[PDB]
Structures are given as structure tokens and as C-alpha cells.
Amino acid sequence: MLTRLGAIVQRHLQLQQQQKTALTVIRLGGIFSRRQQYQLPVNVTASTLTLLLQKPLKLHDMEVVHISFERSALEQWLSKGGEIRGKLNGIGFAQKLNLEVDSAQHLVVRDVSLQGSTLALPGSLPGEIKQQLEELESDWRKQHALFSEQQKCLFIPGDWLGRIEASLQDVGAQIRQAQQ
């Protein structure tokens, strides 16, 4: 439980600069000619997620407030190249857009007037930190339930009860501090 609680503390400090809201694209490793890009790891997991934008543009002779991309189609365009296809306002067919890479690792959507528009993801103790913490806290109660039943063994020295119980209370006192 210590190898999992320490990762939550490091993850809690990393989400302080992500939860105004931007989208940083990372570069995948390897030796390739074109500068390929990679999506976000544990941050996004859905297939048909939506992406917001700051300055709106007139794409296909109509306004749009949110553009959704496909996870199965985003991994191929950012690696093998080609042209990306994405629908507008979550409706219609996956139309083609003039999306390129930005110098500051962003998604600039170009239109018929050569205008820039940085895309971003919609925002929500973070939800990811609380979800990963309750699963680790529930495992501590399951391990303590077995110890709160077999401690009545007569063939156990009494001096060891002060060290085994103190080791379980030390983790419980630390796991309840990050949730404050």
C-alpha cells in the first residue's frame, strides 16, 4: 500500500497545473522522418471525446462551440500522417479540417481565412485522486478485517501486538492526511 499511496501524492501535485485550461501534446519516441505526435495517457480514455476551443471560427459556413474527435482515428493521423476527419457540434459526418501542429504543442485549427484556434479539453480534491484513493483505502480495511479476527490466538506473544498494530495504524494515519 505504500508503493501506491506515494504515487497518489506525486499525482496530486501534477494535476494542480492541469485542472486557463490547455492541452499539451507530447511527442512519441522513436526515429521517424516526420515529427509525429502522441495523445494523452491516463488523462483521456474515452473513444468519442469532445474538445473545446477559445476563439470560435466559421467552419463549413456555420458556427461551432465544440469539436469531437475519434480516439481510433487520432492515433493514426498523428503517426502515419494524412488527413484528419472530424464532425462538428457532435452531429453530422466526420468532415475534413485543416488541423496542424503548434510550436507550443497545441492543436491549431485553420479555416478559410488562415486563423488560429487552440483546442482544449473540457474540465470537471480532483476526481481522479479521490477515485484512486478510495480503492487503496478499501484494501486497508480488508487486510485489517482479517487481523481483527485471528488476534485471539493463544500461541502468539503479547509483545508483538504492539508492533503489528502500530504498523497498520501508521499507514491509516498517512492515507487520511492527503484527503483533508
Binding site: 508503493t3 506515494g6 504515487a7 506525486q10 519516441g29 495517457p41 510550436s103 504543442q105
Partner: protein, 711 residues
């Protein structure tokens, strides 16, 4: 090779007249005539002038002063000594290899003497050259076979195009006519190992003291992969060293084996020591086999001897304690541990044949010798394979090898044979020890700070300085006696900035600034980083390139004490960012970087990171199979805790692998990740000194990402 020496003037006329008549006859066959002065003048025309092949002197004048000093250098050097009537030999001239040609002072017979000198010179050429090189030079002047490979055929196709003539006129007619395939009968074939190629392997192994020395035509990186596919079947166990090369990483990714990594010693300056003697005992080999799942008895062991910095081990103790029937010595940096008495019992080739074991050494050829690129050797001390093993050699070597590299590969073995070649090894050591004494001489007499050489306090002897346990210059905590040695030609300059106890100081200059300063004059630093500087003092560095290094070191102290500007000192760094490096001096840059090392704490985050070993989940061969299918993802720098990496982290500085492809970083290897996060902050404030890690690619914000495997 056309220099003829004429020493001593007898003053008479019946002896000087044939000299003048021969002077006009030797020039008709392209020969340079020189006239030395005294006895010490002729001695300077041999060591400094290697293109000499004729010495003319009076036999009844210096019969003992010249026949002894010349024999100590070149034995096969012809001696055109002119005798007289009352002439005889000496009892002290029997155990000396010489070539004396007697003549007379006959008038008019100078033409017949010139024909004998040309024939004698041709005999010297057909003797010092190996039969493989002799067949290559003769095939150009006589062999004119048509319809052969390659298509140029000595540059014929280049004479039909204007752009092709520019490439043919650069090298020469003899250069293009020397590149032939195996389509020639009187030169043999390298793939068949017969004819001239059969005697070439026996000539290299005899001189370098071996049983069968091969000639790899694809560099050292290929030789390490062919041998690894021999003593490591699909499903075995090898004992590879932790300080491995990039070529050794791909070997573990192509063979389904379970390697076991060691824990070599190390200090705080970044210079890795060696594997302790406790890792070679019988209670250690089988210790990690039962603990690591899916592992059998190790049948092969790879030992990096020496390392990248040049630290020889003790083969007299490994060949007896380490119970491995296939011990490999990565001698890719010491192709000379034989031609000197201060290297006996220090390498694998020194000694005899170990019963039940074999020594594997892949000494580099185009590194510290004299040959073309893509050349290597495989030394054998015992019994190996050749018939079936030749099939594995052809899997990495094409059917048409380049004979220009093979002719130069065997040449390196011929340039070292004899007393004329042994003077290059001993001469490089004397020039290295002299350079070590000049540093200590210019340190105390100087007024201020000065460079220091990582050497013991007593360097008067001429041998390998052992790393004892009662010394403070090496700084290795708990080191075994008579195990670690020192390479005299591997001078390690320690720049001031750290103390002798392992802590930090207040005034110092990092080695990164000095590294770029030497490039302005034409000196490339081999290894640099914290506070160390590695150089190569082989046979290629003569007295000119050795003394020029000290002059560049004294100029750095003058430019730093006078407080000069960056633009008026480092023009290459100023062109990278003229705006930021505008109002900056040499003292402001050296002090700001020194404070970042103490603040970020470099020696503590480096000594604790490379010491521990991350948890290896699967074998490196299984990590390569997942990449071929297309299941490789990446995370952030702070999210790789608990993931299996796919690349080999090679941070600069230092220069050793950190995490092997196929390991997991958990709570045991926490300082390992701390070393990567420290380099991302110290190398982002000042341009030019960016973080260089072969695995942590640069993004655009500052944080680096590594390639891991999908879950």
C-alpha cells in the same frame, strides 16, 4: 620509401668518388639522398624518418657503434656497409638481426651497384608485408581481368560522366583498382578462409598471442553480436556487465536469454570503478539464478575490461575464481596489452590456456590503431568453433567483403611486430608520463588554481598504478587490493570544484565549459561532464599533438583570471544565442553553473541512482517482440513509476546505461528517477548545456518523456 643515408667522410678520394658516382645513379630510379653528420645524426634519421631503407657507411670506422643501436630499432633495415681489405666481424655481432651488403670502391661500376640496391629494397618490401597485402598490390599492376565486380572496375565507369570524374580524381588510380570482390583466385576468399586469407588469421593470432584471430569487416559492434549468438542458446543465462555498450544492448534484445547484471564500484566524480572480487565467487554466480525466475546455469560471462575510461582489471584472479566456461573481455580500448612488460597477466591473452574455459576478446581496430573504419578482431585462447561458426559470421557480413579494410586490419598487426613497432607502445607511455609530470609541475609553481590528474602521489615508476585501499586519490570506498589498475596513457584531468572527501566546494569550474573551449583550437574531448576530462594518447598522438594540449590548458587560466567576455573567447557559443550571451563574462557563467550543482545536489543523486538496480520484470528479448506488434505507449516523467521501459537510458553525463529495456521503477529504485528529474531543471536555464539523454526526448516545455509498454 626511397631515402638513402651516406654517413661519415673518410677524407680520401678513392672512397668519396664512388659516393659521387652513386649519387647520380640512384636519382635515376627515384631515390632521395641525405648526408648526416656525426653518429647521433644518423640515429635521428630512423626514429623520426620511417621512409629510410639504405645506410651507407665505412665498415672500418664504426663497426660496433652503428651495428648495435640500429638493430635495437629496425632489424630488417638493410645496411650498405662498404668493407675494405683488412676487414672482419666481431664476437659481439652474432646475436643481432642485421642485413649487411658488402661492396667495393670500383670506378665505373656504379651502375651495377644501383641495380643491386633497387633489388635489395624490393626484397625488404616483399618481407615486411603480409601475403594478403602483397597479393593486393601485385593484382593492381598485373591483374587486369575483364567482366568482374564491381561495375566501375578500377574507375572506368567514372571516366564516362563529368560528375564521375571528380570522384575518381580525388582518391587515385591505385585506390579504385584495390576494391575487388571474391571473384579472384590468386587472392582467396574471406568467406571460405583459404589461400591468402587462411595465412592472414594465423599471422595476427601469432603476433597478438592468440589461437585464431578473425577479421570482422563491420566494426566492433558487429563482432559483439556474432559471439553473443554462440555461447547463449535460446533459453539460457549470461553474465553481462552493467557498464555495457549500445551494441551489447541489441544483443540481449535478439536472443531469448536471461542476463544477470552486476554492481561495479563507483565514486562521486562519475568514473566507474570495476566489478568487486565478491561477484566472482561460487557463492555469487548461483546466488542470483535461483532468485530470478526462469534462469539456468550461466554459460557465458561478459566483463567490460577495460571500461570506457581505461581501468584494467585482474585476469589472474578471474580466470581461477569465476567458474564460467565462456568469459568475455570487452577489450575494445586496449589493443596493445602484449607489446610491453608492464601488461603481463593483466589481459585475457596474457598467460596460458585455461583448462575447460575460453577467453573471448573483441579488440577494436579503427579506434586506437591504424586502419580503415568498420574493422574488428576476435581473439581466441583455447578451443572454439569455425566450421559451423562461419555460418553465423556470414549472416552479418556480405558475400563481397571490402579488401581495403582487410588489408589495413592485418597491417595493424604487422606495424606492431618487432622492435620497430614496440617503440610506439613504449613511446606513447613515456609521452603520457611526461604529460602527467608537467601538470604537477605547473600546479605548485603557478599562482592560483590549476588542473589535476587522477593519479597517485608517486608516479616515478613506469608501470600500471594499482588501486590500493590506503589511498585517497581514487576515492573508491571499500576496494579490493591488487584488482584495479590504471592506464598510463589514459590521463584523466580533474577540474577543481570538489573536495577529496566527496562533498562540494565553493570555487570551481565545471568540465562542460572547458570541453567546448578545446574545440575552438581543434581538440575534441573524449568524455566530459561533472569534473573530469578523458583523452586518448595512443600511437596517433605524436609529440606535436601532445604538447599542443597543455598550451590550450594554460590559455584557459589566463582568459579566466583576466575576466574576459564570452564573445571574445567562445565564438561558437555566442552564435547560439547572441541576445542572452551579450553582457556575460567568463567568470559570471562559471559561478552560476557551479551554484546549480550544489543546489540540485549532483554527486548524491548520481551515486545513489546508478548503484541500485531496478526490478527487471521480463527479459530484454520479450520487450522487442512487443514493439514489432505496435503496442508502445508513453507517459509523463512523473507518471513512469511502475511501468516497464523499452529503451536504454544513457544520460550524458555520465556515459553508462541507467535503466535496461524491460525493467520497472518502484520504491527500491526511487533515486534512479530522481537523477532524471534533476537533469531536466539544471539543463534548461542556460542555452548550450541542454540535457542529453539517449531516451528522454525533448518536447517544447521542459519535461521529458520516455517510451514504455502498454498495460
Amino acid at each position: 620509401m626511397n631515402v638513402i643515408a651516406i654517413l661519415n667522410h673518410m677524407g680520401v678520394y678513392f672512397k668519396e668518388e664512388p659516393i659521387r658516382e652513386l649519387h647520380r645513379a640512384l636519382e635515376r630510379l627515384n631515390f632521395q639522398i641525405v648526408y648526416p653528420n656525426d653518429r647521433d645524426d644518423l640515429l635521428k634519421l630512423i626514429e623520426n624518418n620511417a621512409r629510410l631503407c639504405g645506410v651507407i657507411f665505412d665498415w672500418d670506422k664504426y663497426n660496433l657503434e652503428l651495428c648495435e643501436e640500429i638493430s635495437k630499432m629496425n632489424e630488417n633495415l638493410p645496411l650498405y656497409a662498404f668493407a675494405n681489405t683488412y676487414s672482419t666481424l666481431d664476437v659481439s655481432l652474432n646475436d643481432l638481426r642485421l642485413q649487411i651488403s658488402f661492396f667495393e670502391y670500383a670506378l665505373g661500376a656504379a651502375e651495377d651497384i644501383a641495380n643491386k640496391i633497387k633489388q635489395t629494397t624490393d626484397e625488404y618490401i616483399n618481407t615486411i608485408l603480409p601475403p594478403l597485402t602483397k597479393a593486393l598490390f601485385k593484382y593492381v599492376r598485373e591483374g587486369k581481368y575483364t567482366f568482374c565486380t564491381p561495375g566501375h572496375m578500377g574507375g572506368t565507369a567514372f571516366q564516362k560522366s563529368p560528375v564521375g570524374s571528380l570522384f575518381y580524381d580525388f582518391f587515385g588510380p591505385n585506390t579504385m583498382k584495390s576494391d575487388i570482390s571474391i571473384s579472384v583466385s590468386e587472392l582467396g576468399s574471406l568467406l571460405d578462409h583459404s589461400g591468402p586469407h587462411k595465412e592472414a588469421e594465423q599471422y595476427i593470432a601469432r603476433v597478438f598471442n592468440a589461437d585464431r584471430s578473425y577479421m570482422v569487416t563491420n566494426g566492433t559492434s558487429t563482432a559483439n553480436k556474432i559471439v553473443g549468438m554462440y555461447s547463449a542458446p535460446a533459453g539460457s543465462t549470461i553474465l553481462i556487465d552493467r557498464n555495457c555498450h549500445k551494441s551489447l544492448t541489441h544483443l540481449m534484445m535478439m536472443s531469448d536469454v536471461t542476463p544477470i547484471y552486476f554492481r561495479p564500484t563507483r565514486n562521486a566524480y562519475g568514473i566507474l570503478g570495476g566489478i568487486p572480487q565478491s561477484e566472482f565467487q561460487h557463492a555469487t554466480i548461483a546466488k542470483r539464478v535461483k532468485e530470478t525466475p526462469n534462469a539456468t546455469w550461466p554459460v557465458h560471462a561478459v566483463i567490460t575490461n577495460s571500461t570506457y575510461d581505461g581501468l584494467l582489471y585482474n585476469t589472474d584472479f578471474i580466470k581461477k575464481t569465476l567458474d564460467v566456461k565462456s568469459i568475455h573481455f570487452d577489450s575494445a580500448w586496449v589493443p596493445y596489452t602484449n607489446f610491453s612488460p608492464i601488461y603481463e597477466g593483466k589481459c585475457g591473452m596474457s598467460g596460458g590456456r585455461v583448462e575447460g574455459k575460453v577467453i573471448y576478446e573483441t579488440q577494436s581496430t579503427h579506434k586506437l590503431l591504424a586502419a580503415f573504419s568498420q574493422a574488428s578482431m576476435i581473439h581466441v585462447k583455447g578451443d572454439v568453433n569455425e566450421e559451423t561458426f562461419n555460418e553465423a559470421y556470414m549472416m552479418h557480413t556480405t558475400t563481397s567483403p571490402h579488401y581495403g579494410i582487410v588489408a589495413s586490419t592485418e597491417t595493424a598487426a604487422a606495424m606492431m611486430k618487432g622492435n620497430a613497432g614496440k617503440r610506439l607502445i613504449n613511446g606513447s607511455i613515456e609521452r603520457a608520463i611526461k604529460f602527467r609530470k608537467e601538470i604537477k609541475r605547473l600546479r605548485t609553481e603557478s599562482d592560483g588554481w590549476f588542473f589535476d590528474v587522477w593519479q597517485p602521489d608517486h608516479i616515478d615508476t613506469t608501470e600500471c598504478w594499482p588501486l590500493r585501499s590506503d589511498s585517497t586519490w581514487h576515492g573508491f570506498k571499500n576496494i579490493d587490493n591488487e584488482h584495479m589498475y590504471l592506464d598510463p596513457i589514459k590521463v584523466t584531468l580533474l577540474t577543481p570544484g570538489m573536495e577529496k572527501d566527496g562533498t562540494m566546494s565553493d570555487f570551481g569550474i565545471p568540465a562542460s565549459i572547458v570541453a567546448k573551449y578545446l574545440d575552438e583550437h581543434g581538440i575534441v574531448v573524449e568524455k566530459t561532464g561533472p569534473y573530469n576530462l578523458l583523452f586518448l594518447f595512443s600511437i596517433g598522438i605524436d609529440k606535436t599533438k601532445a604538447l599542443s594540449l597543455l598550451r590550450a590548458l594554460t590559455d584557459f587560466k589566463r582568459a579566466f583570471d583576466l575576466n574576459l567576455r564570452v564573445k571574445n573567447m567562445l565564438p561558437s557559443l555566442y552564435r547560439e544565442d547572441p541576445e542572452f550571451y551579450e553582457n556575460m563574462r567568463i567568470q559570471e557563467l562559471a559561478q552560476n553553473i557551479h551554484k546549480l550543482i550544489v543546489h540540485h545536489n549532483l554527486p548524491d543523486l548520481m551515486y545513489r541512482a546508478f548503484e541500485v538496480l531496478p526490478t527487471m520484470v521480463m527479459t530484454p528479448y520479450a520487450a522487442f517482440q512487443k514493439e514489432l506488434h505496435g503496442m508502445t505507449e508513453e507517459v509523463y516523467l512523473d507518471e513512469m513509476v511502475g511501468r516497464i521501459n523499452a529503451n536504454m537510458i544513457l544520460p550524458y553525463p555520465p556515459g553508462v546505461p541507467l535503466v535496461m529495456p524491460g525493467e520497472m521503477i518502484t520504491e527500491e529504485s526511487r533515486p534512479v528517477l530522481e537523477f532524471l528529474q534533476m537533469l531536466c531543471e539544471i539543463g534548461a536555464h542556460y542555452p548550450g548545456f541542454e540535457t542529453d539523454i539517449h531516451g528522454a526526448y525533448r518536447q517544447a516545455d521542459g519535461r521529458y518523456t520516455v517510451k514504455v509498454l502498454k498495460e
